[PDB]
């Protein structure tokens, strides 16, 4: 017994996705970046399906559904990598078959970006982040993505309120020792925003340099305004 929204988000959680880096291809920054962008493309399909499970998300206009996903997609991807990484030390679990350490981060040109993701990991390890809290924060990051393009501002605010309420009710029942735990969880969202912004900018620059092939969906979310 905690909160039905939390229960519902847990059963909506997508299945594990394999990176499947091409074993015939020599190891290189281009291979690593190709593997990551391919993995992101596939995860984005599953993120779109998952969003439809979030109560009220479907009742927004298609424009408003697109705007929230265009602003939040990379925060959702990053929160996944952070959650998969909590039991690891200085490694990022992009996928069960794609665990990046510091050297692989240097070789891929991702040392600054992966260091920032590890800063999110460190904070969530010290807070002992629970799956329930992770799925609820992923939903809040979607609802709270601060798109410039929102048509129904009140509806988007009501989706924020519903999810925030779910987090607060979860924390009130599960963590009576810390009555400010919900707030402390919200206080982690600035770092996710910062990290997501840097990731989008880094991958947009790789897109511009033209050396890494990228699929249609990944490209469409990189090109969003």
């Amino acid at each position: 017994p905690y909160n039905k929204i939390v229960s519902h988000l847990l059963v909506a959680e997508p299945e594990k996705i394999y990176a499947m880096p091409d074993p015939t291809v020599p190891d290189s920054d281009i291979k690593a970046l190709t593997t990551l962008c391919d993995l992101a493309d596939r995860e984005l399909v599953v993120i779109i399906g998952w969003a439809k499970h979030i109560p009220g998300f479907s009742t927004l206009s298609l424009a408003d559904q697109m705007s929230l996903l265009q602003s939040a997609w990379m925060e959702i991807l990053i929160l996944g990598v952070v959650y998969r990484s909590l039991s690891f030390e200085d490694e990022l679990v992009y996928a069960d078959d794609y665990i990046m350490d510091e050297d692989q981060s240097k070789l891929a040109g991702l040392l600054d970006l992966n260091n920032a993701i590890l800063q999110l990991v460190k904070k969530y390890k010290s807070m002992k982040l629970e799956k329930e809290e992770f799925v609820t924060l992923k939903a809040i990051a979607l609802a709270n993505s601060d798109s410039m393009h929102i048509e129904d501002v009140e509806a988007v605010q009501k989706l924020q309120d519903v999810l925030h309420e779910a987090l607060q009710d979860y924390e009130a029942g599960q963590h009576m020792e810390d009555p400010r735990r919900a707030g402390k969880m919200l206080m982690t969202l600035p770092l996710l925003r910062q990290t997501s912004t840097k990731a989008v900018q880094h991958f947009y620059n790789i897109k511009l340099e033209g050396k890494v092939p990228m699929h249609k969906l990944f490209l469409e979310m990189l090109e969003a305004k």
Partner: peptide, 12 residues
């Protein structure tokens, strides 16, 4: 318009 994001949001 012909957006893959839109098409995926509209389907199933």
């Amino acid at each position: 318009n012909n957006s893959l994001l839109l098409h995926l949001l509209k389907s199933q």
